[PDB]
Design a protein around this nucleic acid. Sequence first.
RNA 1: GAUUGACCCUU
RNA 2: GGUGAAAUUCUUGGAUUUAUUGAAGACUAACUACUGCGAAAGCAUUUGCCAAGGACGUUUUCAUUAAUCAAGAACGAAAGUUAGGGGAUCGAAGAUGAUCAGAUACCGUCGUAGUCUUAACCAUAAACUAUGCCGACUAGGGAUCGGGUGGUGUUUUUUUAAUGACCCACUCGGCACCUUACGAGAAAUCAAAGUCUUUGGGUUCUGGGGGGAGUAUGGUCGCAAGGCUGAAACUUAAAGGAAUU
Lengths: 96, 200, 25, 127, 97, 91, 63, 226
Amino acid sequence: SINQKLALVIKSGKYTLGYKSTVKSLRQGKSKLIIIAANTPVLRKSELEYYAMLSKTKVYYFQGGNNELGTAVGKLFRVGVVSILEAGDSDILTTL
Amino acid sequence: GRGAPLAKVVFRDPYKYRLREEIFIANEGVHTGQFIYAGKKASLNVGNVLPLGSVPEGTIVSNVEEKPGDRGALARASGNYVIIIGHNPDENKTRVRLPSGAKKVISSDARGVIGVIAGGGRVDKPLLKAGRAFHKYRLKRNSWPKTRGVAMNPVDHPHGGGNHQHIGKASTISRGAVSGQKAGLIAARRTGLLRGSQKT
Amino acid sequence: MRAKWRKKRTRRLKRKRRKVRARSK
Amino acid sequence: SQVFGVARIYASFNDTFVHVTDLSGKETIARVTGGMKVKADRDESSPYAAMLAAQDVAAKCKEVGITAVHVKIRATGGTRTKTPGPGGQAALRALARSGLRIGRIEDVTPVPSDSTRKKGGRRGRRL
Amino acid sequence: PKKRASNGRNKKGRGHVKPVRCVNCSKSIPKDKAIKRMAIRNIVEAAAVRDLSEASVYPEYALPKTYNKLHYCVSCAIHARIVRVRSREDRKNRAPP
Amino acid sequence: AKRTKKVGITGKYGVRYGSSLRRQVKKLEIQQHARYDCSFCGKKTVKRGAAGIWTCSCCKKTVAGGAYTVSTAAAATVRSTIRRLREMVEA
Amino acid sequence: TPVTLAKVIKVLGRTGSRGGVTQVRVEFLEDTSRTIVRNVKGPVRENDILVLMESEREARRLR
Amino acid sequence: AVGKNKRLSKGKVVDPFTRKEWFDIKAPSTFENRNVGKTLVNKSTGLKSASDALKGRVVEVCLADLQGSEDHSFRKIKLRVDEVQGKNLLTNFHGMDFTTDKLRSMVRKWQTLIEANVTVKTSDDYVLRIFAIAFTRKQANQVKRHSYAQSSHIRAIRKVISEILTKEVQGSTLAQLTSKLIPEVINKEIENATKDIFPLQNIHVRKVKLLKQPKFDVGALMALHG
RNA sequence: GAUUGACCCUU
RNA sequence: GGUGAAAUUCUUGGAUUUAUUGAAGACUAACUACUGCGAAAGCAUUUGCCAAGGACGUUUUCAUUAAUCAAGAACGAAAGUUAGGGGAUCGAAGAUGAUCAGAUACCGUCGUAGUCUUAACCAUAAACUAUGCCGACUAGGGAUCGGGUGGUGUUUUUUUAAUGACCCACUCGGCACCUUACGAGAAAUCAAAGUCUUUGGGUUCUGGGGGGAGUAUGGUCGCAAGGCUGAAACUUAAAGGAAUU
């Protein structure tokens, strides 16, 4: 499941949380995937999509709000977008 | 004075460079920044103002026009709605169920917002206080408090007077009665406690 | 008497006793 | 050769409907029951009354023009008996003996998948 | 005294069984306790078969049969003689005849 | 921890108005003074301004809801049936 | 009245609450292999002729 | 019952059969037999328009009578009138429904019944619900009395049946689906795609019903195509 | 599956 | 439409019957079984998600962590209660026709509360297997469910490797069944209700003739209905358990 793959990427690979860090990593071109929460503002989601199209990054639309995305990532706060820099031991990047 | 919130919706003027603001009756779920689509080709979404001909059967509509173009007459109080019972395309007429359970055949061109009126459940709370009733009616109209006619003098009411507070004659008044007589239960088909439900 | 009806009658007697004692006290 | 209608037999208890409609079912012919044929209120489902009504509908539908029927037998169904009353067998037998051609006999008694609630209380009809 | 080791029903390891309405009196009885029987019968009562065959348009007609399941409460089944009171020793005959 | 056994927020009415009326008022008053999740920003910051008006302090968004709850069951069922009819119309 | 002639082919047996009637099976002279179950008020024996005002009915079981 | 009516004229004769006239119902081209019977209607006055007053109707016709075959006697087809053309009005497919006797015949105990339903849309925007009924069967040389399925075989069967029905209906128009439904080839496709999970006899596809319909379509093609 | 309710004295 | 003949009833302003439909709420038929799961209550339409569980397999790990359990708690059919939804059907109350000596009963037609859900209560049932839980041991079997040591035993594909499923030895864990008694019992009957005057494996609960009485009173929980705890005075020679003729 997506939650299991995200937990595996949390345990083994490299991840960043948040709009500002995600956009900065998209500018540097180091983001290999970005997960966007379902309740994120449509304007921010479209801007993230524009950045990911410019940098050829894959965009995965999480099936849940920022609360659910943060819980999946394993934090106790809200996460709107999470950028996966490398999977390490998961197949989240290789698939989809 | 209104239990339902109002929505200030801004539209563009199709013929002039101008913004036209309209005052809608807010349905549940409508929020600021939302797009409202009003028209024949508008989609079956909460807050849109489709005609009854465009909406299908079982649709929950509100602020429904009694006649096309009167800009909303039916199901406007908080929590209220209209059921689209059916259509009749030849001599286009939509049959609808009104909040009182009444059947109404109205034109298929009559508009109506989709959803239920916001602010529902309002009458589920006890007022608890003559003060709360006072503040409720202070900005509706001067209809409160209500002195009982039986507590007046015979000069003031049909019920006034007597050495005991009693109505005296039957309190059911004919529809053919006159002003000054029509005090009580006007044209009542029955009285007393009824064992039943509305059953539309 | 059927035991269910005897039990119902005893319940009625019990609540009548309760009402009378409540009135007295 | 043959012109087709639908016999639409409804063999309930205390009555039997035998009324022939068009193939679509929107145009009926000779809506006749055993009640119209028997005087006593208790024989409205008798096989005699069913046969009488079937003869009447066959005669009238021959006056109309239809020569063959497709038989759709139906009991009360739903939460009711679900078994055909005494009248349906006599009704189709009477149609056959009246000489109306017959094809595609089918029982169409409404059988509920998880009905609402049978009437009679949990203790039943204590008779 | 315990009349039957099955308690007059068929329920071991259940606790509760959804009820069924009797076909005669519409009495609620547990489904496992009913006297359910299968009625599979010719539609033409096996007497008007000749008349139906001669008045049929279509030859070699299949002549379908009706299928239903009649659920009897114990009282109605005994009354209508679907089952009957048996001797004590042969109440244990699970085998139908 | 608890200063009242059962009256709760209705401890301001004292002994007046009757226990049953106070209990109904208690239920609806808890409902109307609760803080609700914002479906837009995900934070429990939605408060009632007036009957039917529910504002989120964070994202500055006003919602039209029930008199004492941000969303009534009637509204939820209505939006579900509107979705059902809309999907049936589209396909 | 259309009268049909039929001959009893087997006396099935006495029936009725008081036994006053007998169920028999009758065969029709025309349309060979056409037999109908009828009842008898008086006596009835093998090879007996029969007049029926109507013949579109059967009695299967009595109890 | 003859004279028990306590009131007969609360408010206070021409022959309807004489006043009516006969039409003819013609099946689409996908079936072998074109004529499927006749129907009545009142003569078209100026205030009734018998043409459209009768164009909105359907007829249930047996597939055996449609195809002149014995092995289709347990199927029925709903045909819905779409056009009228001089007393020879034309009909189109509404839905196939099985027969009560046949369904009650193939539903029996000491075996598992499997039911699936899918509401896939066609290529030409027909939304249809197809119901497939299968039955686990006793093998050869088997001594066990029942041979039930195991409620995960059942789920796998329902999954493969749903996939097959979606794959068939997606890409096939309504006419093509009817034309491949008469030969019941989808039943055999399901049989073959299932046989590796359970034997599962009697894979007859049960009723299929038309949930929704596209526009009028009255212009240039049904002459050749029905 | 109608209406058949009742019957003061000892081991 | 209804009943054993019948009649409040609806009905030529069209009733029932037949269209094509649409809406609502409930339910989940046939498959459905001496079959399954759950601690019980209970649980039967699909897909997905969410966590959980038994049994089996293990040449994994811990190491006695265990059994039963006063206080203390979780769940707990239906009915019922407080509000909000819902309100098709059926239907305590009630309305009403009938049989009747009477019928505010059975039977007929309506029909509020209820039946369905959401929060909160209630905490009872012939809640039964009227059979507490754990452990061991004692004629034999046709069967069945979940696993399932094995038997170069069958089918589409290639009848000439292979990933099905069935058929037979058969372990293990379940729901149960089938003929004297090894035994038990008052018997009915019971592979447990046996291994109890040849009387002791561990442990919890309960009973001490019938009634008064599950009453009174005092607590305690409950919105209430009531639940749990719970007597005495007094009365009584039987009341009961297996159907032997």
